[PDB]
Design a protein around this ligand. Structure first.
Ligand SMILES: [Cu+]
Ligand SMILES: [Cu+]
Ligand SMILES: [Cu+]
Ligand SMILES: [Cu+]
Ligand SMILES: [Mg+2]
Ligand SMILES: [Mg+2]
Ligand SMILES: [Mg+2]
Lengths: 67, 67
């Protein structure tokens, strides 16, 4: 499954790495790709293992806003 | 001694942390304080031990531009 989340506050490569790392530490997330130019975060996942709510919380816990 | 560097590209707390760590790794740098709001980086150092050239290089090696 794929989810595209729109995120505010990611301003550089360090933010990209923080977000991708946080998402990839969740069991069930297969990969994550931040696009800093448009704020889009694309998550590939097993939808029997992880909910989108968990993705949003992981990102917000890193200090960003899911919009 | 005190040096103020003007640095472009620091966008967030991760950038701040990276710049301060790189500077504090240099022998003779006592402390470093990034102001993200104006790009100024204040470095306290022993001017017998460290040159400003070493500070600029450390910053530019982390990917930022020193003015
Ligand atoms: Cu950043
Ligand atoms: Cu950041
Ligand atoms: Cu940053
Ligand atoms: Cu950064
Ligand atoms: Mg969906
Ligand atoms: Mg993983
Ligand atoms: Mg030190």
């Amino acid at each position: 499954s794929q989810e595209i989340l729109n995120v505010e506050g990611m301003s550089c490569g360090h933010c990209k790495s923080a977000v991708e790392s946080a998402l990839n530490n969740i069991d069930g997330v297969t990969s994550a790709d931040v696009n800093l130019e448009n704020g889009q975060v694309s998550v590939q996942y097993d939808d029997s293992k992880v909910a989108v709510s968990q993705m949003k919380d992981a990102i917000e816990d890193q200090g960003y806003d899911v919009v």
